Design a protein around this ligand. Structure first.
Ligand SMILES: COc1ncccc1Nc1nccc(-c2cc(C#N)c3c(c2)[C@](C)(CO)CN3)n1
Length: 331
């Protein structure tokens, strides 16, 4: 590896996942070290994984070889996300710009060279001095977060359909010992017709140390300060399920202050499950929201039960962008 990084450093190349990943570990170490006097010409290095993004004489610099256009897509965990275009190739993609001192190698290690239709493809990452640019496939439908906010809440079949696709992605990750760490509607992206969903933003990922994401979606073992595994993702996937059904995060409509105490102490938020839900839906969420991770179902197991729950309600019938359903009111 140490000869590989030596040969990769100071250049942008077309290459493979392991090359990006090796060089990503070097960036995370640099971010830990104190800032130095910056050179006249910024360090430019990285790996592009697709022919859609072409280095020119082993350089890939913003404004020179590519540019952002229109307004930002949103805020990711550690950086803003923009639409960008390669000026040579004319291919568009998404760029997340992350400060080096905030950059976690797991941003890339968790999704580099993965081939799941349920995980946003990584196109590469390029460093310009203290900035890491992370390139990924552009998905035109926007976030599951935006749809839920727009529609108020999703009908059961639609919620099951997306939860189902998210758990296919988490199974793929979990079998390769990857914890996503921030499973919520905001980090699920939809295709333009809303038929395909994919996990994005691996800012909180760990390769099996867990930086917790949104307090509302955190498993009891995280909050208590106990050591974590892939089961933390299964808990958050059911918190995201309740969010899609109720149009609000779990906990928030009953408790104030830092919720971390309530998550540790209370029974699981199974009371937030709508009474109108199908029996297999209620059961799926119950088994996903077990406080003890050893008894909580796997992503693979919950994926099965959710697929069965979807069949039981009659499959995906509800329209793409239907009518506003009033989110649940506080009691
Ligand atoms: C029209 O396109 C869109 N409009 C609205 C939202 C998202 C998109 N499309 C898109 N395509 C590819 C990637 C991303 C993306 C990556 C990350 C990361 N890492 C990320 C997000 C979007 C957030 C939802 C930004 O708020 C969270 N962190 N988005």
């Amino acid at each position: 590896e140490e000869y590989l990084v030596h040969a990769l450093q100071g250049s942008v190349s077309s290459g493979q996942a392991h090359s990006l990943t090796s060089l990503a570990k070097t960036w995370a170490a640099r971010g830990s070290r104190s800032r130095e006097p910056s050179p006249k010409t910024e360090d430019n290095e990285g790996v592009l994984l697709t022919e859609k993004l072409k280095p020119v004489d082993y350089e890939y610099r913003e404004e020179v070889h590519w540019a952002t256009h229109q307004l930002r897509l949103g805020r990711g965990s550690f950086g803003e996300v923009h639409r960008m275009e390669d000026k040579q190739t004319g291919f568009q993609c998404a760029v997340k710009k992350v400060r080096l001192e905030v950059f976690r190698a797991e941003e890339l290690m968790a999704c580099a060279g993965l081939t799941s239709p349920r995980i946003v493809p990584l196109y590469g990452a390029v460093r310009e001095g203290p900035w890491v640019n992370i390139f990924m496939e552009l998905l035109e439908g926007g976030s599951l977060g935006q749809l839920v906010k727009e529609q108020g809440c999703l009908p059961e079949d639609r919620a099951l359909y997306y939860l189902g696709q998210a758990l296919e992605g988490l199974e793929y990750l979990h079998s390769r010992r990857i914890l996503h760490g921030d499973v919520k509607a905001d980090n699920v992206l939809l295709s333009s017709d809303g038929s395909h969903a994919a996990l994005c933003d691996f800012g909180h990922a760990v390769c099996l140390d867990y930086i917790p994401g949104t307090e509302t979606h955190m498993a009891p073992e995280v909050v208590l300060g106990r050591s974590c595994d892939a089961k933390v993702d299964v808990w958050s996937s059911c918190c995201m399920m309740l969010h899609m059904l109720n149009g609000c995060h779990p906990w928030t409509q009953f408790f104030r202050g830092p919720l971390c105490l309530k998550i540790a102490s209370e029974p699981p938020p199974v009371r937030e499950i709508p009474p109108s839900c199908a029996p297999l839906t209620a059961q799926a969420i119950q088994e996903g929201l077990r406080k003890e991770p050893i008894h909580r179902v796997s992503a693979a197991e919950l994926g099965g039960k959710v697929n069965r729950a979807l069949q039981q309600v009659g499959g995906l019938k509800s329209p793409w962008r239907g009518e506003y359903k009033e989110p649940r009111h506080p009691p």
